Design an enzyme around this catalytic site. Sequence first.
Site, PDB file in Angstrom:
ATOM      1  N   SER A   1       0.850  -1.197   0.000  1.00 22.22           N
ATOM      2  CA  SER A   1       0.000   0.000   0.000  1.00 22.22           C
ATOM      3  C   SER A   1       0.881   1.241   0.000  1.00 22.22           C
ATOM      4  O   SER A   1       1.775   1.370   0.834  1.00 22.22           O
ATOM      5  N   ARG A   2       0.696   2.152  -0.963  1.00 26.26           N
ATOM      6  CA  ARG A   2       1.623   3.275  -1.204  1.00 26.26           C
ATOM      7  C   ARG A   2       1.399   4.475  -0.309  1.00 26.26           C
ATOM      8  O   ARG A   2       2.271   5.326  -0.201  1.00 26.26           O
ATOM      9  N   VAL A   3       0.267   4.529   0.381  1.00 23.37           N
ATOM     10  CA  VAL A   3       0.067   5.412   1.537  1.00 23.37           C
ATOM     11  C   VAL A   3       0.743   4.862   2.793  1.00 23.37           C
ATOM     12  O   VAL A   3       1.259   5.633   3.597  1.00 23.37           O
TER      13      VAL A   3
END
Lengths: 50, 464, 464, 93, 97, 516, 349
Positions: free
Chosen positions: G325-327
């Site tokens: 997940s890039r957050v």
Amino acid sequence: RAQASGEVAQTLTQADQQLSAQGDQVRSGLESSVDGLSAKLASRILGVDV
Amino acid sequence: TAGRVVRITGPVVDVEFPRGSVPELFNALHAEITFGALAKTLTLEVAQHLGDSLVRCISMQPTDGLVRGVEVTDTGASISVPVGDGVKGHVFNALGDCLDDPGYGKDFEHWSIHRKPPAFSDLEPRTEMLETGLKVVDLLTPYVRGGKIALFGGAGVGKTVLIQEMINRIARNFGGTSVFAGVGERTREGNDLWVELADANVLKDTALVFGQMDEPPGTRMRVALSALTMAEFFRDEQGQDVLLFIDNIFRFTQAGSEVSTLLGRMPSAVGYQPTLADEMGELQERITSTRGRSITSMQAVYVPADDYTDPAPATTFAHLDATTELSRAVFSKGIFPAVDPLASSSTILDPAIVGDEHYRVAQEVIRILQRYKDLQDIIAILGIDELSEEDKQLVNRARRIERFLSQNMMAAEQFTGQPGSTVPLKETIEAFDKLTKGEFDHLPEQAFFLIGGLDDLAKKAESL
Amino acid sequence: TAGRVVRITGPVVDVEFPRGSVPELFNALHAEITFGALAKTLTLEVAQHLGDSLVRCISMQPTDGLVRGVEVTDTGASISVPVGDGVKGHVFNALGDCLDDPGYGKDFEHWSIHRKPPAFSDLEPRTEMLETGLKVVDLLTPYVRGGKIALFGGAGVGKTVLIQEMINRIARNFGGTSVFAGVGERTREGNDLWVELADANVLKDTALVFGQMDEPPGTRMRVALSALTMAEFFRDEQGQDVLLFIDNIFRFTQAGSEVSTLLGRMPSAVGYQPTLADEMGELQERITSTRGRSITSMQAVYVPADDYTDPAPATTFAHLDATTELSRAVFSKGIFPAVDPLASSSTILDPAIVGDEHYRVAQEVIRILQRYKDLQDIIAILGIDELSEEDKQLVNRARRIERFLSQNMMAAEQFTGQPGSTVPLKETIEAFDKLTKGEFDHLPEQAFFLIGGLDDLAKKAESL
Amino acid sequence: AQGAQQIQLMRQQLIRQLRTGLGAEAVNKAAEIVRAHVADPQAQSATVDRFLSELEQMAPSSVVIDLRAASRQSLAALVEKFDSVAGGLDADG
Amino acid sequence: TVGLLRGERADEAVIDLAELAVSRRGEVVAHVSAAAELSDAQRTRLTEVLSRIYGRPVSVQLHVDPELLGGLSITVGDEVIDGSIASRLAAAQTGLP
Amino acid sequence: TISAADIEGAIEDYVSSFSADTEREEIGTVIDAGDGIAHVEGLPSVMTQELLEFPGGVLGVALNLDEHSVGAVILGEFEKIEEGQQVKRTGEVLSVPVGDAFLGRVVNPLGQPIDGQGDIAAETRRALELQAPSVVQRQSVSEPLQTGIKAIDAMTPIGRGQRQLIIGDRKTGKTAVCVDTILNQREAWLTGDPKQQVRCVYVAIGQKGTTIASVKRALEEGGAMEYTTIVAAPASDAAGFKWLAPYTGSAIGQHWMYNGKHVLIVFDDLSKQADAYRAISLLLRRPPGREAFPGDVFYLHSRLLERCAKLSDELGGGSMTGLPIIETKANDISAFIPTNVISITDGQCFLESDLFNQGVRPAINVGVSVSRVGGAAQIKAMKEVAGSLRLDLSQYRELEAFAAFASDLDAASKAQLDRGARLVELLKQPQYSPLAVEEQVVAIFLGTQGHLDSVPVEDVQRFESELLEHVKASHSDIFDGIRETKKLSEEAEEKLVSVINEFKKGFQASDGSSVV
Amino acid sequence: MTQELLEFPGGVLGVALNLDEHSVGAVILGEFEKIEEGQQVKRTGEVLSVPVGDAFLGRVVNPLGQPIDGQGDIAAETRRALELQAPSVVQRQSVSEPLQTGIKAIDAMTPIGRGQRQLIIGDRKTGKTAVCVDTILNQREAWLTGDPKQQVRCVYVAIGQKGTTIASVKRALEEGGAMEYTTIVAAPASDAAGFKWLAPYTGSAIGQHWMYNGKHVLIVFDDLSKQADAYRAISLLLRRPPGREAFPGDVFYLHSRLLERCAKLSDELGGGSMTGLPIIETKANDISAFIPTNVISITDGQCFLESDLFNQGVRPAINVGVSVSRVGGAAQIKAMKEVAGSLRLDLSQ
């Protein structure tokens, strides 16, 4: 190599100031000539002594 | 009566004719190009009829410099090529124009390139072996009279020497002639070959036909049909046996796919023309024997990506009867003519078609060479001293069989000055039968190089 | 005098004009949308002339609610963008209006989006190295100050994290100006950039342009040319050197492919528009730095299906001085920032430019990682215990080198929790020189992972 | 030697600029004097005459020329049928 | 013709009718353009030269327009004479070193 | 220095020459324009490939001739085109100026100067599409094109007249191999003999502008800009200029060829030639075949390449040598363009990125590259040395897996393993250092005659470079004798081996050991 | 107008997608059987819209927003146009608060935050639906607080699902009380390619109406491969030339303008948000294929569910190498960032 390269770089600045000074003079001289050359060009466009 | 050029797109030209005067398809049409630096007579082949009296054509020469509305004259016949004994010793393009001396052969009889293969009633009802007189060919991979033989190799593998050899064989044994079809040949190679056949002095019995790579795909397609129409005249009217080389039959498939794409037809599996298996058939079915006379063929075949499932090789290998493969690993041992005895194959090698003894001796020679081919790794890595005595006795025979396949071929007479040998089949089956049983193992390898027949082995053994 | 809409299909609108009024290519037209919540003025760019006074156009806002026969007014010029000093510190859409302060650009000097690239006389090659303090980048793919630099990678291999780290390393220190083009980037990471640049002071000298992936193909094409027309003003009319960041430059060629089928061009290989290389080249050449006025470009390229053979990546690779090629196969090993050591490359990596100490170490590290990638298929089946002592020693060096090319980036604070680190070029060279000569082969393999420099490597090896 | 070449390039850049820049003033100044000559019709009627005498000096006729085949031949046949019919019918027909 | 236009443009149709009408009259038409109308004698000269440039007699339709500020241009079939002073000045501007 | 007389004289000389022939000619009108193409109605007398000139000064090629209207691809300034513009025809098919004044210049595909170094003194003009030399006008290839790369001239020789393909992946050194080839020729060019002087055209297709400047700077530093022309079609120039750029480089080349000079053409790279022709062809609605290329793309490359040849003595005995480059996606050689050019060319130097990473630079795959000309392109002194080199490298490539177990391997092949590892080092070479023939024959000699067998592998390139500097100082008469006789005579060989042993006594290895 | 609703005489509707020089090319949004040549068409005067409101909570609806659960008509609050633009870069705010899924392998390792898009990509029968239905079920502990600044509303959009699968999901939600706050949009397999194409947009419109009113929303799209197939069918019947893999040229713009419309708004717009869980079904387990690599590049992270991890007892079957997940840890509570902060990198190693 570094010294000969550095001298060429500064020589290009010496040429830029010479050519811009002589260019600003010679473009003024040519503005007189171009009015005379233009009258010949108009006579070549029309085919008559305008 | 003449037509008008009405559209031009790349090599493709459409022409319009007066209502009643529309040409039959596969006619040749002539059109002039009149710009000075590009001055030509352009030849068009008729491909389709589009209605409204329009005719869709492909150009046998570059369309560059052609102008809309120029006149077009119909020749009323197909593309036609000169036929007669006076074709031999000259180089022709696909259109039957000479390259060695321009304007030669105008007075010859001209045959249509598009003509049917033999009727069903004329064919020979059994295959017959061709006795070519080369030890390796006649034993391991017998050729079929009026069959087709695939050839594999390249430069530095004697391929041009095998071509000069097979030309000499047909001229001197069978009293036949050869025709050579440069189907998309490199112009440099076409000049190296023309000089090589002249220096060998074999050119005096061969007709050369070149469709160069420089020219649009209509010419690179029609060259093979042109060369085959010269060979058909020599089979049918002169009553000679003929040997038709094709180099390379893959470029006939490719050029057909590019003409089918310029004609805008939908391409098939992997992009080839939808006519492919018929379009190859109309060329390969025509190479055959009838009424006691025959057109043998050798066909250099390129394989794309080295896979035998691709439609271009997979259509081609349906037709041909034998496969001769040349190997650098055999040439580097000095074994001329460098035919690989294990990778090469033939479909006439069966006990029903060749004698039971010939099949036995061929299966024995293949077995002995297959053992040595398996052992070469042990020899190279561990040396002959790492072998037992039972298999070292097999290698002692295999070294000598591998040498004894070599022959003083007629093509080498240019250099060695000695004549080339032509062994009878019935001698070479005896020589390999005796040799596989070991009756010559006490002679050194130098006694078997370049030797020819068995009575010659006796003469070289007493010399050494 | 003005025209009217004739045909509408998705983003493409055909318009008709009076006999003499037909507009040039790439003019901006206007049209009015009148329904309720969709009511807006629509701007519309000319793509083709269809004959009989018809013109085909590409819409910038969505065409939803547009109606046949509505009036269309030719503005007589191309799309225009505000340029000047007061552009710094604001956020613009593709069309040049400020999102964070509406109407702001109306009183600036405006320039045309479209212009020819600089003439070949004005270009000189750029050969000063840009330090960035990333281990792998400064060692294996050294960047060019005034060059064109790129990141490549498949979907989701962290390209948008690495480019936000490049802003954070380069643009912080940089004393000139900078521009960021959001070309089809996902809007959330556009807002995470706008707020991060406002939490630091860097927004005071940065001009942002956003044409994000929610907008239709017109803006995704023209936003790259708009943000570039801001940078070309700072390069040309001011001489002040500039950083131009672009994310993602593939979306330019993608948006071209999305309209091309509607514009009526036959599709080429894998469905791209046939203009691809000419259409991209007329953009990529404008990004160059002419003598004495640097642009440093940093652009992220998407790679469809991870397929580095695909026409768009394969065209783009011609245009670049340094390429940092990311790979999912390295990302799956957790080796963040996941650059491929073997595919990534730079033109400045010559021993005349970087000095031989750098070049030796870079070429030794690549030799080791290449030999390791060759051995992985043996090691996965036969096991490391089977290898030569020199090969097994090399695999233990390579597995350490791979992990020492990983780094704790500052932007990865939310990925790792640990703060970020910068490694000097000299310390990077000394550390990989020691690694290739085995002076760290006594350390545990996990000590090198994410760690940064040698003082950190020691401190983590003491933590274990 | 490359420094001397780069000075020669900057000189030639100035030569190029001045010869074309002079020509651009020469041509626009020639348009000013032409526009003044043309302003009254005594120039127009003379100028079409210098052109028309030039066209009498131009080469005499060299071109004879001065809708697909089935429709075109049908139209030719129709025009031949018309020519016979209207040639009798014309005066009220 | 206005009764049966079926897809054509009206100005192109009436110009096609005039071409048809003069072709039936045994002549041909040239479209001529100049800043001012020539004298009647000068139009007889224009007819006397075009009747030597072509086989049929040529009628002329003078489309006066100010852009050709000196000289004139002649269009016949789809070949032209670029005789205007405005074309001469464009050729001077473009052809200059 | 700049003067008022010359500026006044040039302008007055144009002004007093300015006139128009007023000639009757055919005109058409643009009916359609988009994406780099225009359609022109009218022009009944246009010819296929005629230069059309549009009113904005831009040009087009009239490449398609439909019933209703010409299809014309537009060269460069496409934005200036509108419906209703008058199209004039120039009276000729595509032509380029040619001559000796092109040497050291950079030009666009029309032969206009693009380096800014003023106007070019054109000597003669040639049509782009004249007939290639026919099979009766040629001669067998029998003169070396010295490449100055050990891995090429020793194994895949190039003879002047050959067409050699530098096929490889991106960033494997294809441009570096061709720049080394062009740089090498200075050692011949400084001699006055027209038989030895080679003249070079480098044709850049779809490069970025700074990459062409980088090549020019790399040829300036070597002095090759005395004798080389760069044809530049950078990526910004319209698909028409990219498509013409090989043809105009060939059309310049042919003028020097037909005057009895020797020419080298490098095409960099023909994958972007093909990709530009596909763009033009699909915009013209011509039918797509495989990989979307139009039908004729084999003929596009063939009519380009088959113009490279060696002429007979009756045509002054000139030649032209083609080094086409192509780029291969993920090392495949079964894609449409690679398959076409591999069938058209005489030899194929496969460069491979795996060998480039492993240290073997330049990355020639000596196990799969070949030349159909072979030994006819090599001087006798090189045949005498290199004739076993391919066999040694083939036996080494088979043996390579036994390196883990060399104690147990039989001595007769252990010596072949120790040799092969030293030959693979001996073939490495740094960029912009091409070796003269007389120095590479002594380099291949060290390995093939087994004098190198006592040097540890890691010291081999240093030993080669130190010996070649030593001999070039103390004993240049070995090199003079090789060059002047083309044969490694037994006196030069006995002198060389004496000097190799004398050098070994003065050398040291990187581990500090003696090598004697 | 372009994308106006047409009314055909059977009471069936359609959308005007092509406006030619002389005809309108329309897609029928319902039972096409009743259409004849030569019959009347009336325009509606409305750009393509759907009814919206909080009355939709607990209902199953056709894509046009009318019910199919049989429980009578819906008291819709307003209409909303399906193609209103996404909130621009100035209107959005950073994701900072968690969407609790209650699955360890997600919430610790690849967190989902309010206003993220997280792609639940996988093969047939690997748990894609099971993760999403479990996520919608976990929210009950928040809903029972009755507070609009922490309760989540849900929309589940079934595209191309068979009708008994949708009826199974419905009762699996009723078993956990989630039909108190869930709406189902159902385009079951029988329905024409118009409904099967449209279902994700009407989901996003019903969602947006609560989002801009300051409520927190979760959208599940199940699954966008059946929307991409339905848009392929519509485009090819309309005779638009296809691009790659026979998809329409703009199949990216089908999904981008669907997924970008879900984000967290600034506090100047009530501070509501919409969280998107699209699903993609990858054939033959390859992630490197056209449609999946589009949606991987549009969304903020992947939960790649692999069948050969599912079979070997790793359930839920998240491939820990590819999944991300890039957050990241900006969307977790402090305790979970301290405890789990490196766990994805430690497992991929």
